[PDB]
Amino acid sequence: IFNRDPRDHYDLLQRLGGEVFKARDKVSGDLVALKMVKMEPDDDVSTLQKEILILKTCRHANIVAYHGSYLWLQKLWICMEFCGAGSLQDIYQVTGSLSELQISYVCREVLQGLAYLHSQKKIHRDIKGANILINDAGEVRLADFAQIGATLARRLAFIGTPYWMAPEVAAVALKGCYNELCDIWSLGITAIELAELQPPLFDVHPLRVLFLMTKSGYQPPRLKEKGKWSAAFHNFIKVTLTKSPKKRPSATKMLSHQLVSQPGLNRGLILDLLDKLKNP
Numbered sequence: 001i002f003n004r005d006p007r008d009h010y011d012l013l014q015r016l017g018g019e020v021f022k023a024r025d026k027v028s029g030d031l032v033a034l035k036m037v038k039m040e041p042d043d044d045v046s047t048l049q050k051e052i053l054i055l056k057t058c059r060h061a062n063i064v065a066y067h068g069s070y071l072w073l074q075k076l077w078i079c080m081e082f083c084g085a086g087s088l089q090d091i092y093q094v095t096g097s098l099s100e101l102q103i104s105y106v107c108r109e110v111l112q113g114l115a116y117l118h119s120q121k122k123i124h125r126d127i128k129g130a131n132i133l134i135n136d137a138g139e140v141r142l143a144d145f146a147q148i149g150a151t152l153a154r155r156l157a158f159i160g161t162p163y164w165m166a167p168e169v170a171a172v173a174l175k176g177c178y179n180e181l182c183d184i185w186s187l188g189i190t191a192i193e194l195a196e197l198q199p200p201l202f203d204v205h206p207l208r209v210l211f212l213m214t215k216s217g218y219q220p221p222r223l224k225e226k227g228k229w230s231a232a233f234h235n236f237i238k239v240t241l242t243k244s245p246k247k248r249p250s251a252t253k254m255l256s257h258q259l260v261s262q263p264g265l266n267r268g269l270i271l272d273l274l275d276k277l278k279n280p
């Protein structure tokens with residue numbers, strides 16, 4: 001983590017949403033994304049060092065490249081590879097729902113990133129449309145993977161108060177005790193999201209959604225229209241949304257599934273999508 005004004009090395013161009021910036025390298029000419037974070041009272045950047053070193057050693061085509069961080073004037077600027085189409089959520093809010101094939105390509109590319117992340121003993125944890133970014137070439141990039149500020153404040157005010165927590169609580173509070181196969185589940189939900197513009201139960205209260213998942217006789221969600229999709233896509237959803245982690249398949253096992261291993265899946269499918277965005 002570097003320790004100077006990133007304006008020295010980069011030129012700001014425009015705000016995007018939520019304060020992420022379009023920017024260009026003054027020397028290299030490469031476009032970048034700068035994710036900025038305010039840091040007021042008693043934030044410590046040195047507690048994000050194990051999570052930055054996870055993000056730095058991630059070197060894969062389907063992961064957003066990390067380029068370095070900048071602490072300056074009580075602000076943390078995280079620099080990254082720019083994806084000019086935004087997230088799949090940004091796109092589908094204009095385009096409407098994705099075709100099965102477009103979803104199939106997305107799922108394979110996401111699976112490829114997850115396979116890589118899992119082989120390194122890393123877990124993504126927040127797989128959804130908003131974190132699947134798309135470049136102008138129609139390639140698929142997973143975004144950064146929480147432990148800071150008002151977010152880390154709120155999250156623990158739930159589990160307990162940190163100074164009074166036991167080690168077993170602490171362990172759960174930081175990491176969740178759960179495994180890589182959680183991302184496989186999250187992908188299955190994302191495939192429904194892309195298909196239907198919302199995940200299952202988006203009109204239901206989040207806590208009740210969580211509660212029901214723990215109850216006996218729980219049924220994992222499904223695609224709403226049966227006839228719109230192939231049996232292969234219905235199977236992809238069945239299998240990713242396996243209730244038990246013990247029986248849910250791995251990312252590499254999922255790359256053998258008909259839906260993602262079928263021929264003719266490539267970035268052209270998303271080039272159609274980005275054309276549709278421009279002409280909606």
Ligand SMILES: Cc1cccc(F)c1-c1cc2c(cnn2-c2ccc(N3CCN(C)CC3)cc2)cc1C#N
Nearest residue numbers: 018020033035081082083084085086087130143144
């Ligand atoms: C996902 C995310 C959540 C929260 C904070 C964040 F910084 C990011 C985030 C956003 C990112 C990138 C890399 N590129 N972009 C990016 C670029 C342009 C656009 N726009 C939207 C409006 N359109 C009209 C044009 C296209 C959207 C997103 C990396 C992260 C990370 N990590």
